[PDB]
């Protein structure tokens, strides 16, 4: 065995563990989610596991979807000098075209044999795994300050008397047993002798700190396009209440969509409809209020 | 209920056919899975035949044994986040 604990400022190591674990957790959660936002009229007719596509797109490798046996299996694809042949690395096994491939972008609208590359972002300047590191430390220390604020927001009622058995019988039989009408000696024995340590310099501070945590989440959120935007259009709470500057959050949402524009180039080739929409739906009540067809009653209940 | 309890301990369940009626089974770059190599929880209802994963071989054609993840990309278990807030709470 080996044991000799520090003190009870162990909490001052537990506090910094909460901050450190919060940064690690929020960082890898936020990129645990971020490669699924778009999902684009999900599997109309096309054999793509779009989850495996979007995970590949957020490590910035240019995937290439084409035909394999007329059914659109993904492949990897790493002034205008045109690409034609299957020179690139190919991830499937025997489903390779073994024939004339092409990029279907500008050779014509809708004619050439399909192997179209899809960028994550049309013009690439900085990776957004750096922006997610940029705010999560700032977010980490505001989560530190919230946790440190509510950890010292606890309150005792200090009794103050010369020690051995004068005031103990008082609080036992007449405060925590709830008793009104306790009788005492005239020796100033509650003339502000019992005192309260309060932290009312802490609870007005508490709510404003939560609002700073909240709008910093929103200021990370609208950067990476994930937004509450369309419902904010129909709710009429459009500007300076949701302090987000709508023209910037509809801006950063749109760059990721027109990065995945070459799926429309593919969609024009084989005669089908694939639009890169932007997912904001969460179900069992939204699907109920949009239909209210009695077959949807036998589906849910 | 027995599926969702299995999914939140992160074990990839696999639902397929048993006698055409979708009994659960357990299922623990793309290298394809076909055969019944995985651990099988039911007793005699096993397909004893050609199984496959029905994801990308075609849309809607191959024999069914599809694996369902709890979370598409896994980074941290949420039994840690529930420990993360409950002490603060």
């Amino acid at each position: 065995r080996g044991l000799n604990v520090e003190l009870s400022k162990e909490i001052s190591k537990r506090v910094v563990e909460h901050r450190n674990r919060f940064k690690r957790l929020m960082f890898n959660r936020y990129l645990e989610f971020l490669p699924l936002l778009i999902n684009y009229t999900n599997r109309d007719t096309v054999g793509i596991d779009f989850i495996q596509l979007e995970s590949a797109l957020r490590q910035n490798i240019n995937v290439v979807v084409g035909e394999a046996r007329n059914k659109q299996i993904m492949i990897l694809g790493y002034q205008k000098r045109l690409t034609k042949e299957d020179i690139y690395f190919i991830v499937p096994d025997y489903l390779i075209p073994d024939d004339c491939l092409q990029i279907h972008k500008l050779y014509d609208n809708c004619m050439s044999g399909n192997f179209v590359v899809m960028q994550n972002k049309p013009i690439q300047y900085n990776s957004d795994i750096e922006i997610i590191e940029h705010y999560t430390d700032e977010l980490a220390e505001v989560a530190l300050s919230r946790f440190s604020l509510i950890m010292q927001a606890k309150f005792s009622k200090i009794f103050k008397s010369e020690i051995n058995d004068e005031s103990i019988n008082q609080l036992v039989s007449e405060i925590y047993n709830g008793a009104p009408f306790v009788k005492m000696s005239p020796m100033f024995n509650a003339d502000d002798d019992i005192i309260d340590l309060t932290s009312n310099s802490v609870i007005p501070a508490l709510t404003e700190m939560k609002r700073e945590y909240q709008n910093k989440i929103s200021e990370l959120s609208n950067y990476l396009g994930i937004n509450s935007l369309a419902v904010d259009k129909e709710s009429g709470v459009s500007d300076e209440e949701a302090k987000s500057n709508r023209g910037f959050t509809t801006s950063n949402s749109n760059i990721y969509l027109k990065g995945r524009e070459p799926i429309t180039f593919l969609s024009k080739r084989y005669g089908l409809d694939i639009k890169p929409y932007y997912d904001d739906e969460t179900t069992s009540k939204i699907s109920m209020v949009d239909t209210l067809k009695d077959e949807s009653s036998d589906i849910n209940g | 209920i027995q599926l969702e309890s299995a999914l939140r301990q992160n074990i990839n369940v696999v639902v397929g056919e048993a006698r055409n009626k979708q009994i659960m089974i357990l299922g623990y770059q793309k290298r394809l899975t076909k055969e019944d190599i995985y651990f099988i929880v039911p007793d005699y209802l096993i397909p004893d035949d050609c199984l496959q994963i029905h994801k990308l071989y075609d849309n809607c054609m191959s024999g069914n044994f599809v694996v369902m993840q709890n979370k598409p990309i896994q980074y941290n278990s949420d039994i840690e986040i529930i420990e993360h807030y409950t002490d603060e709470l």
């Binding site: 096994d93 025997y94 | 076909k34 496959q52 071989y57 054609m61 024999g63």
Partner: peptide, 24 residues
Amino acid sequence: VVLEQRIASLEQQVTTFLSSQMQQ
């Protein structure tokens, strides 16, 4: 209509058995 589905099911059954002994 029914055949269209069974014909699709048996072609995948042939394809996932040919690849078990393929040169591919």
